[PDB]
């Protein structure tokens, strides 16, 4: 916001999506004005914001605190000799792109 700001996730932000077990899935918080009504229509309570699931490409409303901040200069978890080859990877790549895109965007508020 302005003066004293540091908390709660903000739209257009790369984070980690919790699915279950040691397995996870990257995603980026999106805005309700961005996603289609189809998503908007989705009910909610509070905090829960629209997020886009990479690889799959699906929007959902998930509370906050369950998602983690995706780092760039580091990983040590999902990278280093891999012979899986699945949607995940596709998501990983996308998740990366976005992160690179977000930061790589014209100046407009913020």
Q: Where are the domains of the chain?
A: 1-110
| Integer angstrom CA distances of residue 54 from 38, 106, 107 | 18, 23, 25
Which residue in this structure is represented by tokens 């999106």? 30
In DSSP terms, which residues pair with 78 in a beta bridge?
none
Reference 58, options 96, 89, 23, 17; nearest CA is 17
Distance of alpha carbon 28 from alpha carbon 52, whole angstroms: 6
SS3 61: strand
**CATH code, residues 1-110:** 2.30.30.140
Q: How many residues does the chain have?
A: 110
């Amino acid at each position: 916001g302005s003066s004293g700001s540091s908390g709660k996730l903000h739209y257009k932000q790369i984070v980690w999506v919790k699915l279950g077990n040691y397995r996870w899935w990257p995603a980026e918080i999106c805005n309700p004005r961005s996603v289609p009504l189809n998503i908007q229509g989705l009910k909610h309570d509070l905090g829960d914001f629209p997020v886009f699931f990479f690889g799959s490409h699906d929007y959902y409303w998930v509370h906050q605190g369950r998602v983690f901040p995706y780092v760039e200069g580091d990983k040590s978890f999902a990278e280093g000799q891999t012979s899986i080859n699945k949607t995940f990877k596709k998501a990983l790549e996308e998740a990366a792109k976005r992160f690179q895109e977000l930061k790589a965007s014209g100046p407009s508020s913020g």
